[PDB]
Write a protein that binds this ligand. Structure first.
Ligand code: HEM
Length: 296
């Protein structure tokens, strides 16, 4: 039998519109503000961004398996992927919000969590479309589709071809490593990429270019790039300035945060929408207001 790419058609949750989704955004954003202690006062923002990326990064363009549509991270096989270690904290953050808004699909909730986190950490607006539909447990992708960190630029470039991302999209997406940190017990790496861990800036590119990096072994026997300031870079991060095509784009975003914000917004929306067919009568993407813009 011929493997044709499955078609996943978006279906708006019955009788819901912009205001219903803005209500869910606000609930996420208010909990982000109130549960501020997590991970030594970094807050949940970074882990929600990582969650939105990991539920989307399983996509394979060749057969349209994986991706954010089906919300399959809720199932044990994907929940327990070693590559997803640490994301359970993001899932538990969202669980009460799902109980307050039971009508939203899992893929819509997980992807909206990442959009809300970016915007509430003062990043760019990210347009967002609803209509992901929960699919059954047999549609869960096998473990092993997410990328390894102990690799070089050629691996990064060919990995992201599977997600239909080009060099600029890859470099823009990687700027999310301004946020949060690596945790030895989750991934075998330890340390933050920069100082402003929970504000969305172009700091990742500035640190890449301006710090003095040294390759060192960490307590898990892996090698990572460390600077005297106490920052770290993964081998795949540092590959962005070893490769001359990636380096040109790193320099662009280090010098113009506005360009970075624009390109990141487009690439992050594309990541979250890969694999989904939106009907012709589907609503336009929503742009949610921040809590600040609402006076909340
Ligand atoms: C080659 C591609 C990538 C690799 C190898 C990679 C690898 C990693 C690893 C090993 C961690 C540490 C996890 C932990 O120890 O808790 C991490 C954290 C993180 N990643 Fe990436 N990542 C990649 C791309 C991305 C993308 C495309 C995004 C989002 C657009 C992203 C967002 C994040 C965030 C926000 C964190 C911090 C999470 C936290 O503080 O809990 N990553 N990444």
């Amino acid at each position: 039998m011929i493997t044709t790419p499955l078609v996943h058609v978006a279906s708006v949750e019955k009788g819901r519109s912009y205001e219903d989704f803005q209500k869910v955004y606000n609930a996420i954003a208010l909990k982000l503000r109130e549960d501020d202690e997590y991970d030594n006062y970094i807050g949940y923002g970074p882990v929600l961004v990582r969650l939105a990326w990991h539920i989307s990064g399983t996509w394979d363009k060749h057969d349209n398996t994986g991706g954010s549509y089906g919300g399959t991270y809720r199932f044990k096989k994907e929940f327990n992927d070693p590559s997803n270690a640490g994301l359970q904290n993001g899932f538990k953050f969202l669980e009460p919000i799902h109980k307050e808004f039971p009508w939203i699909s899992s893929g819509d909730l997980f992807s909206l969590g990442g959009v809300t986190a970016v915007q509430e950490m003062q990043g760019p607006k990210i347009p967002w479309r609803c209509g992901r539909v929960d699919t059954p447990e047999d549609t869960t992708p096998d473990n092993g589709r997410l990328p390894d960190a102990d690799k070089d630029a050629g691996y990064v470039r060919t990995f992201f071809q599977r997600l239909n991302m080009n060099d600029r999209e890859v470099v823009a997406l990687m700027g999310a490593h301004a946020l949060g940190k690596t945790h030895l017990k989750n991934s075998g790496y330890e340390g933050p990429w920069g100082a402003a861990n929970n504000v969305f800036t172009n700091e990742f590119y500035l640190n890449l270019l301006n710090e003095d990096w040294k390759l060192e072994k960490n307590d898990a026997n892996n090698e990572q790039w460390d600077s005297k300031s106490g920052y770290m870079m993964l081998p795949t991060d540092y590959s962005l300035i070893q490769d001359p095509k990636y380096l040109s784009i790193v320099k662009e975003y280090a010098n113009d945060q506005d360009k970075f914000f624009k390109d990141f917004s487009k690439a992050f929306e594309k990541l979250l929408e890969n694999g989904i067919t939106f009907p012709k009568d589907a609503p336009s993407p929503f742009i949610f207001k921040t809590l600040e813009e609402q006076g909340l």
